[PDB]
Design a binder for this molecule. Structure first.
Ligand code: ZN
Ligand code: ZN
Lengths: 150, 155
């Protein structure tokens, strides 16, 4: 049923602490992003000829990174809706399984992945900004992260 | 292949900051046990455990069976050794492939229980099933030993 109970419980603890420490939902989001960026290096180590540049190559690399971290492909990788960005959709996000928060729309419970993906892309020569577009933890049907190529 | 890289990296961040802040070394172990007890409190309710064990545990055989079932639920394997020390009223848990300290190599930190979070988790779970215990880590591959070992003191 629930995949990686240990990871989701430890991350729940991290989210609880950040929420208790910050003074706004915006800053909580940014702190979770920063956490993910800090972890990206170690995650990259524990897991060809020229840096990729096209959005199709970026989307393929995103699919490969998602397979490597989560043993599966993303529900959707979309290069059409937003333009200049790639939207990653997952209907069974590992981070927010069974998490139901009320009155917290706009809080990206799963922004750690924004940071992880931003750091991994940076290591591969892809400069980007990533934020969580929506989270099932706050009522959405899926989780969506927005990767903007800068 | 490092198992569970996300969990390991997040726990590596937590121990790093919990080695930058705390006073001594033993209170760092207590902070890690406390973290583990919170995680175990949360863990008994999203249930891969409730289906795979009994609600009420008392006897020594029940305790050993509970430790093995909890290990197989949380880590998808049973530990290398579960040794019941009846004359000491304890249980020694040995694991040669602990998930927490994979590829961790800390210099001159013997006595630091890098993997005490499991002490907290197990203490909370045993407690939830009616077993008053005190769990602490005796050795950790992260600090130079060949195995990780935890001690369940039964009270
Ligand atoms: Zn999510
Ligand atoms: Zn260990």
């Amino acid at each position: 049923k629930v995949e990686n109970p240990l990871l989701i419980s430890l991350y729940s603890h991290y989210v609880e602490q950040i929420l208790s420490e910050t003074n706004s939902i915006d800053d909580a989001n940014q702190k979770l992003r920063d956490l993910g960026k800090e972890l990206g290096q170690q995650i990259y180590l524990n897991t060809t000829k020229e840096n990729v540049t096209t959005r199709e190559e970026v989307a393929k690399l995103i699919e490969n990174v998602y397979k490597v971290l989560f043993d599966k492909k993303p529900k959707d990788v979309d290069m059409k809706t937003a333009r200049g960005s790639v939207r990653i959709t997952d209907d069974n996000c590992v981070w927010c399984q069974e998490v139901n928060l009320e009155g917290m729309r706009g809080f990206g419970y799963c922004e750690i992945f924004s940071g992880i993906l931003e750091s991994i892309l940076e290591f591969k020569g892809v400069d980007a900004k990533v934020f969580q577009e929506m989270s099932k933890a706050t009522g959405s049907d899926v989780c969506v992260w927005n990767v903007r190529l800068v």
